[PDB]
Each structure stands twice: as structure tokens, then as C-alpha cells.
Amino acid sequence: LLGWGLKQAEEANKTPDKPDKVWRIQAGKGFNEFPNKEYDLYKSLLSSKIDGGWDWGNAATHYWIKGGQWNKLEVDMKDAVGTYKLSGLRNFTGGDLDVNMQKATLRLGQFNGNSFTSYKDSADRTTRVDFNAKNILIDNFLEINNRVGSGAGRKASSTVLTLQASEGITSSKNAEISLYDGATLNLASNSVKLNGNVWMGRLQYVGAYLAPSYSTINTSKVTGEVNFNHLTVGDHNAAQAGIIASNK
Amino acid sequence: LLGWGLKQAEEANKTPDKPDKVWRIQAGKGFNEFPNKEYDLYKSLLSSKIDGGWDWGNAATHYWIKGGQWNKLEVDMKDAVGTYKLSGLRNFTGGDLDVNMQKATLRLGQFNGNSFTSYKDSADRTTRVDFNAKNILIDNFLEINNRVGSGAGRKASSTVLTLQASEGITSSKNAEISLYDGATLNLASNSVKLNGNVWMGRLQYVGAYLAPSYSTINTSKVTGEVNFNHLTVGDHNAAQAGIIASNKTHIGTLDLWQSAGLNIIAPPEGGYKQKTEVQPTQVIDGPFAGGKDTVVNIDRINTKADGTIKVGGFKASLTTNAAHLNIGKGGVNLSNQASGRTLLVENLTGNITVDGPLRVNNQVGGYALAGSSANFEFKAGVDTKNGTATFNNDISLGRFVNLKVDAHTANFKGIDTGNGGFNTLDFSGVTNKVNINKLITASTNVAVKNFNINELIVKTNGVSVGEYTHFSEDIGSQSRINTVRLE
Amino acid sequence: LLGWGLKQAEEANKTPDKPDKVWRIQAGKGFNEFPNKEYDLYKSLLSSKIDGGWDWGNAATHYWIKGGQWNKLEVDMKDAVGTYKLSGLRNFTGGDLDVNMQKATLRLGQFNGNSFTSYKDSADRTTRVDFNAKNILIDNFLEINNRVGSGAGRKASSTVLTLQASEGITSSKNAEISLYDGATLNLASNSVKLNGNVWMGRLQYVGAYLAPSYSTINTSKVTGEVNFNHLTVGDHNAAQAGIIASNK
């Protein structure tokens, strides 16, 4: 009912959140001397301050940071050389990651996909998940603001995912990026070339055929060559996606 | 998870409810002297003690009796002559109507349909809506135990609707009776002839594709001629409907789902019939044997099939208790998606007499790919083990379709598998004889222990090799072929 | 510390319990005319008034009768002819079954075993599970008063299982009857011949090496030929089993 131009304008200027317990993790020695090692990133580094679980209501899995979904985690590598992978961080409710990886290659998929979701509390929080890699190489599917399990329990509010390489964000052939009712996706590399099914707007719940279902892929900072391959807007509803592109 | 035979057995013997405030209304003078007047029934009589409203949560409309949904209303005409109509009593939650109308014609639809629903309180109540007219004449749609609005608020428990004419319950052409997860429908007239889309089992909620969704149409008392016209079981779930019929059940087009059941149960041979707290005895019945003169004359079995892809099929089925499961000239259709759909035309204590072409996707050939193994299946006389499966039509199997018959004596007239190939023509369940009249094979997996095929055509498969006719089990001694003719 | 002769003497004369809601089920028509049919007994008959679940604490499975473990279920066939099987009723806490099956063959195992357990409430109840078949034919393992899951949550009190055929109670080769700290087992057929590992006394909990762990197999009514094959008393504790036999 509002339209996309009001909803994006009210998500474009928000202070992030007010987190108590800003956890901080710094990758020390060991990481910055093996330039081909193919680490894991969850189990080798991030699993210290990210604890999974089971949500009663919409019950599939559950992830947050530490002691509730209102705690910021920030990770500061800045020199860790290698190639890191997520591979299975599904239904991450969480809140305010920050992974600073200069001169490091990321990989958002290996045998399993990823998800980045929020919950609708009374505070209406976003999740502001950041990555700052050098290549990103999506390489499996990634849902942004999905449904956690099935409908009941707690509902899902908006989110923001920011991917900020400095050499390129490619993708696989079967890597379906699929962002839903509240999700955005900021890209800031040069020469984004998503060779997979980008799916803006999707049925968040199983029967909500009258949802507004906005989305955004703000590729404004991409100084190179934006190149989608198969964009797909809308699924059994009146979706109004939008792209804030970069003049090519 | 329970199955239909337990759920119907726990709804068949319940005391109705415990209502405070049993309202009573008696139609007095005025009604019983105008035999053609075409009254209304809600606004002229029933609106005194039925008050509508608006429910917050699942918000469309709302109806109850008086001061909550736990109050019985009973109406006692017994002499009011005319023709009454409901015409628009939608989302009636209510509880325990009783409309006694001898020598009166009812009409459950005029420009609008009806609905009879309950709510899921902590007491788990039914609604036991009754009518006792002389003709009923449904004439527009009627939902039993529907969804009230959309999902939220209060959910819907079971219900019972009883229609008890004494001259006949006909229906329109566009009168879609559609009963859902908890609903039943008792009929007690003579010569029910529902000429509309009876829809047992339906998506009660908008996304609940994993609901059990039982139902029942207990036409046991119908002393005349039960006659459906278009029955449709299941809708995007694993519905298990059931009919407790009255030993003569002509239906027309039957449309199962991928994973839908049906239990047409004929009657038996003699016909029907602190402090501790002793619950009443719950008599519960296993699958018995229908009587001798019990017929189920289905005349078309389609199957709707679309959706996902599972590692198996889905095995639509209908299970009968009748001594004769005739199937008429429309035969058997079977829609086939990527995985292999399956039809199970079972008969526990009877025979099967199919007189129609076994189509696939509504053509007689019916090609199917390797992953899509369209599996026909028949079970004539499972529990008594002396049931024949007579086919009086020249059947025709295309490619990757697998007829199997598990009977006592599987008579035939002609099988054509020389067209497509890869045809598992199983007969391993057959007790002794498979009296096929004519056989055409290309790449067949015949498994018969005793047969009499008095004509055999064996065709080749063009230029490909490794594919051949294969009697892949013990042929025994008493076998016989009166003519072999290779080509 | 009490010894077996006091503990059996205090379980031998107890009034059963005081159950509210004595559910009653009667097998009607259909069952009594197919003498070879090989029914199932849980799913075809008993699943109406026995509902499973999940117990939090010692979490494997959970079974009771209806609305708590203090409700008696009694089933009255008395003419149902066939051959019935249980096949998988594990961790039945329940309380006071009664299955009356004259002229019917039972089978307490087909691809899965059985269990009959209680809980230690403040009322100290038993479970008094009865069967009254014609042959019984155990044919897979059966634990009496086992541990439900692992230790925590609610503990297990005593139980009584009574098997009352009228033609014989045989058993398989791999059918390990194994009754624990509180369990008994009354047999009342003629010619019991248990060809499996009868295991009186067993570690109920994972580390309780100082449990008393009594048991009893009261085969007093067996008018025929009692015949065990491999009896095994005690397991890593001071178990004191006992058999009240029938002079052969």
C-alpha cells in the first residue's frame, strides 16, 4: 500500500541499532601465512561467539550471536590470507555481524547454502550483516530474510546484507540468491557478475498471497560491470522489487 | 496418522454435548395452511434465536445461537406445510440445531450457499446440525466444517450434518457439497441423487498441505437408489475419505488425488443391527466382509496429479468391501508427473469387473519415461482369497507402465504391450489361473505361476537388444498355450 | 538393604491403583471372522486411546494412555480371531493396560521390540500391564521397567507385566527379555519355553553400580513344562533376582 519508493526511503536512512555486548574477535597469528589453505570460517573462527539451537514454533534450526539476538559481533582480520567458507549457516537470526577480511577470499557456499533472517520483536530490528572480502564467489544459494521454519512462532522483520569485495562478486550456475519481503542487498565491489537465478520477491509464508513483498539490490557502488544473468521478480503475489543501479 | 477407521470409530459413538439453555421454538398458526407459499426460513422463523456478528481473527462473518456457541436450538414444526429456504447462512458456528419439518420441502440454496462450522474450544464440541424435511433439494453449494475467514483467530473442530428427508435429496448442477477435515454427512432419505460436485476432503487452511483431512458420507439409511454424479476426493494433500454406503452405490466420475484414499464400505450380510469414572464402551470395527448383494458401480476413475517430486510415487487408492466392484465404460485414467504415479483399486472381500480402457494421461497408449513408472494395481478378494478380477476389455499398455493383479483368478481378453516396452506385467499374487485370450509383448516381465494363454503374439523391439519377453518365475506344470505366433 | 524377600512380599499384595477415566474399547465386528489375517494391534486397534510424544529430560520417546499416566485402558475382545502384533511400543509409561484376547495369537515383536516402564511420581504407581492371549510368541526383545532415555527428568518406579496364554509362551532365539530394578513378570500359561536370553537384573542407569536391583519371574501358574534356556542374573552390581517357580 505504501509503494516501494517510501519503503526504501525509510530503510535507507536508519541508525543501525543499539546493541549491548558488542563482542569483538580478532584473528591473530596463524591465519596470515598460508595463502592457499582453504579454511572454514564458522567452525574455525566464528563458532566461538555464535551459538545455534532450536526454536519452538517454526521449528527447523536457530542461530544468534550470544545471549539473545540483540548482540553485535564484529570480527577484525584485516590481514588473514587464505580462502574462507561459510557452508551451512542456515536461519541465522543473529544481529549485526561484521567480518572484515581484506586480502582474503570468501565463499558463501560449499555443499550447503546460507540464510540471514531476523525476528519481529517489539523493537523492529534489522540484522545488518556485513562482509568485506576481496573476492566473494557465492557458489551456492543464499536466502536473505527467509522464513525460519513454517509460519508460527515469531515472524520475520527486515534485514540488510552488505557484500563489499574489491575484485568481484561472481556466482555459480546453481546459486539462487533469493531475497524476500524485507530484505535488501548492497553490493560494492567492481564487476559483479551473478550467473545465477536472482529471485527478488518470493512467498515468505506458505499462503500469504496478499503480501506487499518489497526488496532492493542496491548495486550503486559497483565501479565496473554489473551483469545479472537471470533475474526473476515476484512469485504468486504483487511484488514490487527495485534496483538502484550504477548507470550500466 | 491414525487412519480413517479409527477416527470414524471415535466419532460414531459420542454423546452429543451438554448444552445449557436449550432454546425451543414452535411454529404455530399461519404456516400450516398455505401449501405453495415459498417462505424464507432464517428471516421468517429462525432469526429470533440465531444472531450473527463479526469474529476478530479470521474475519468474514460469524453466527451462533444465543449467548455463545454452546446453546442448543431446537425447532418443532411437524405440520408446517410449504417450501422453506435457507439462502445465505454462511459460517454458522452455532451448535446443535434441530429443525423438525415433516410434510415440508426444504431448499438449502437460493442465490447464496450455506456453511456449518465449529470452533476449537477447550471442550472439543461438534455442531450436530439436523434437518428433517420431506424433500431437501440442495440447489446451491454447502460447505461442512469450512474455514471461517483466513486461518487466524479460532480454528475449526469437527461437525456432523444430518439430512433426513422422506422422499429424496436431489441437488442442482452447480451445487458443490464440499466437506472438510472433520466433517461428516449423514443422509437418511430414499433415492439420494446428488447431481453436483461432491468434494470430500479439501484444503481447510490456505497452506496446510500436510493435514490428515478425513471425512465421511454415511448414506447407510438410504433405502432407495444412491446416485452420486461427480465425486472428488482430496485436494493437494493426503486425504482419506470414506463412504459407509447402503449396498447399491452407483457413482459417476471419481477424481482421486495423487495420495488420496477412499473406503466405500458396504453393509454386512444381515444388514446393520476422588472417584473413578467409567467411560462408555467404544465399539470399534475392523474391515469386515460386505454382503452378497452389495454393488459399487463406479463408471470413471480419473486422477489429478501435479506438484512436487518424491522418491516414490503417491499411490492413490480406493478400498471397497462390496461383493462386486464393477467399473464401467470410462475405465481408468491416470495422470503421471515425473515420479511414478500409482493406482490401487483394492477389494477386500469381493470381485473386480473392469469393462474399460486403462488409459494414461487420457490416451489408451500412455507413454511414460523411465522415472515415471505409472503403476496400475488391482487386488480382488484380499482377505477371503477367492476373488476374480475379470477384465472384459482389450487393455493396452504403453511404455514404462506396470500392470499388476493380485487375485484368485484373473480373467482377461487381450493385452497389448508390443507398443512401448518396459512393462512389468506382474501376476505373482494370482492364486491359480490367468485366462488371457491374446497377448502381445515387446519387452515384458511376465511373472505367472499358472496360465492359459490361447493365443500368443511375440513381437520384436526393432533394432535394440537386451529387451525381450521374459517369463521370469516358475511356470509349473498346468500351464498351456493353444497358439504361439512369433513374427 | 531390605533383601528380596521383603520387597517381593510388599509387591505381592497391593491393590492395583485408583484410576480416574477407565477408558474402555471393545473390538466389534470384522475381527472375528478372518482366522489368518495377521493384523497389527497398535495401529489398527490400540492407537485410539494411546498417544505418544516426547519427554523433556531423558529424551527418546514417550507413551501414555490418554491425558496423563494415571488412566486405565481396558480392551475387551474375547472373540477376535487372528494373530496380532505389537512391534514397536517402546518406552510405554502408560498405566494399567488390559488386553483380553481369548482365541487370539499375540506376537510381541516384529522388526522392533517393546518396553513397559513407569515414572516415579509422588504417588508411587505401578503399570500392571496385562495380556490374555492364546499363544504369545515373544519373537523379539522386551524390556520391563527400562530407563526411558538417559537418566535425567523423571525416574522409573516399579511395574508388573502379566502374560496369560492358554497354550504356551515360546520365544525366539534373539528375544532378550530383560527386566530391571522394579520389574516383575507373571506367567500363567502351560509350557513356557523361553528360548532367549532372560536377563534378570540390569544396569537401569548408566553409572548406578550400587543399585539394589531386584526382580521376579513368578511362573507359579504354569501347569506344564517351564523351560528357560539362558538365564543371566546381574550386571555390574549386586542384583538379587528371584523366581517363584512351579515345582519343575
Short mmCIF file of C-alpha atoms in Angstrom, two decimals, chain A residues 72-204:
data_model
loop_
_atom_site.label_atom_id
_atom_site.label_comp_id
_atom_site.label_asym_id
_atom_site.label_seq_id
_atom_site.Cartn_x
_atom_site.Cartn_y
_atom_site.Cartn_z
CA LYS A 72 26.65 -7.24 17.86
CA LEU A 73 29.55 -9.45 16.82
CA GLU A 74 32.41 -7.84 14.96
CA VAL A 75 35.41 -9.71 13.58
CA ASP A 76 38.58 -7.91 12.55
CA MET A 77 41.05 -9.88 10.47
CA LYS A 78 42.48 -7.23 8.05
CA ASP A 79 45.49 -9.41 7.18
CA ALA A 80 44.30 -13.02 7.24
CA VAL A 81 45.28 -14.54 3.91
CA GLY A 82 43.58 -17.63 2.59
CA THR A 83 40.16 -18.66 1.33
CA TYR A 84 37.34 -18.95 3.84
CA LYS A 85 33.93 -20.52 3.51
CA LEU A 86 30.64 -20.44 5.37
CA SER A 87 28.88 -23.60 4.11
CA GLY A 88 25.74 -24.08 6.11
CA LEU A 89 24.86 -21.09 8.27
CA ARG A 90 21.11 -21.52 7.87
CA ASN A 91 18.38 -19.49 9.61
CA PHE A 92 20.82 -17.03 11.14
CA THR A 93 18.64 -14.63 13.12
CA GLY A 94 21.59 -13.09 14.90
CA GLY A 95 22.04 -9.40 14.57
CA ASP A 96 24.85 -7.20 13.34
CA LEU A 97 27.73 -9.30 12.12
CA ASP A 98 30.83 -7.60 10.77
CA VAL A 99 33.53 -9.63 9.07
CA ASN A 100 36.45 -7.51 7.92
CA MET A 101 38.61 -9.58 5.55
CA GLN A 102 40.93 -7.60 3.39
CA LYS A 103 43.21 -9.74 1.15
CA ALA A 104 41.03 -12.80 1.82
CA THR A 105 38.74 -14.74 -0.48
CA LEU A 106 35.30 -15.64 0.83
CA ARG A 107 32.98 -18.41 -0.35
CA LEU A 108 29.33 -18.36 0.69
CA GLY A 109 28.63 -21.96 -0.20
CA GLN A 110 30.12 -25.43 -0.15
CA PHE A 111 27.64 -28.38 -0.13
CA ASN A 112 25.08 -26.20 1.70
CA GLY A 113 23.61 -22.72 1.45
CA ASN A 114 23.19 -19.80 3.80
CA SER A 115 20.40 -17.73 5.29
CA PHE A 116 20.20 -14.39 7.08
CA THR A 117 16.92 -13.69 8.83
CA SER A 118 15.54 -11.52 11.62
CA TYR A 119 12.73 -11.74 14.13
CA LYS A 120 9.86 -9.33 14.68
CA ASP A 121 10.30 -8.23 18.26
CA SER A 122 8.71 -5.11 19.71
CA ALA A 123 11.86 -3.17 18.79
CA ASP A 124 11.74 -3.83 14.99
CA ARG A 125 15.40 -4.59 14.48
CA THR A 126 17.41 -5.30 11.33
CA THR A 127 20.42 -7.59 11.08
CA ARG A 128 22.95 -5.53 9.05
CA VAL A 129 25.17 -8.48 8.12
CA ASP A 130 28.42 -7.30 6.56
CA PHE A 131 31.35 -8.91 4.76
CA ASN A 132 34.41 -7.15 3.46
CA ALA A 133 36.27 -9.79 1.46
CA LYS A 134 38.42 -9.48 -1.68
CA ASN A 135 36.62 -11.98 -3.87
CA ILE A 136 33.30 -13.35 -2.62
CA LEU A 137 32.34 -16.21 -5.00
CA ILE A 138 28.80 -17.03 -3.80
CA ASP A 139 28.87 -20.59 -5.21
CA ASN A 140 25.68 -21.89 -3.56
CA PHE A 141 22.29 -20.47 -2.69
CA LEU A 142 21.73 -17.67 -0.19
CA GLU A 143 18.36 -16.63 1.22
CA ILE A 144 18.03 -13.16 2.69
CA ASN A 145 15.17 -12.68 5.19
CA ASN A 146 13.67 -16.11 4.67
CA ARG A 147 11.05 -17.88 6.72
CA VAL A 148 12.70 -19.74 9.58
CA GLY A 149 10.57 -22.86 9.74
CA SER A 150 6.86 -22.82 8.99
CA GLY A 151 4.92 -19.69 9.80
CA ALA A 152 4.17 -19.88 13.51
CA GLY A 153 6.20 -18.72 16.49
CA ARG A 154 7.97 -15.47 15.70
CA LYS A 155 7.67 -13.69 12.37
CA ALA A 156 10.48 -12.15 10.34
CA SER A 157 11.26 -8.43 10.14
CA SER A 158 13.59 -6.72 7.67
CA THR A 159 17.32 -7.24 7.11
CA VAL A 160 20.30 -5.83 5.22
CA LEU A 161 23.16 -7.81 3.70
CA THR A 162 26.24 -5.94 2.51
CA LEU A 163 28.89 -7.64 0.40
CA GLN A 164 31.91 -5.46 -0.20
CA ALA A 165 34.62 -7.19 -2.21
CA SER A 166 37.30 -5.29 -4.07
CA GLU A 167 37.82 -7.61 -7.05
CA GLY A 168 34.45 -9.08 -7.97
CA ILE A 169 31.39 -10.92 -6.74
CA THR A 170 30.82 -13.81 -9.08
CA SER A 171 28.39 -16.65 -8.56
CA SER A 172 27.75 -20.23 -9.59
CA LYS A 173 25.27 -21.60 -12.06
CA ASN A 174 23.01 -23.07 -9.36
CA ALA A 175 23.46 -20.31 -6.76
CA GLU A 176 19.95 -18.93 -6.28
CA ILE A 177 20.08 -15.63 -4.45
CA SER A 178 16.52 -15.16 -3.23
CA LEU A 179 15.61 -12.15 -1.12
CA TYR A 180 12.17 -11.70 0.39
CA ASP A 181 9.67 -9.18 1.85
CA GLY A 182 12.08 -7.08 3.88
CA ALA A 183 15.48 -7.92 2.51
CA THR A 184 17.98 -5.72 0.74
CA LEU A 185 21.38 -6.50 -0.74
CA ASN A 186 24.10 -3.89 -1.04
CA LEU A 187 26.99 -4.69 -3.36
CA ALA A 188 30.11 -2.56 -3.51
CA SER A 189 32.76 -4.43 -5.49
CA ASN A 190 33.71 -3.89 -9.08
CA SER A 191 32.37 -6.20 -11.82
CA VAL A 192 29.54 -8.04 -10.14
CA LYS A 193 28.58 -10.96 -12.37
CA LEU A 194 25.84 -13.04 -10.77
CA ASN A 195 25.45 -16.04 -13.06
CA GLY A 196 22.56 -17.48 -11.04
CA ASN A 197 18.84 -17.11 -10.51
CA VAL A 198 18.47 -13.85 -8.63
CA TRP A 199 14.96 -14.02 -7.20
CA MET A 200 13.67 -10.69 -5.87
CA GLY A 201 10.41 -11.16 -4.05
CA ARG A 202 9.20 -14.59 -3.02
CA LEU A 203 6.42 -16.17 -0.99
CA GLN A 204 7.75 -15.64 2.51
#
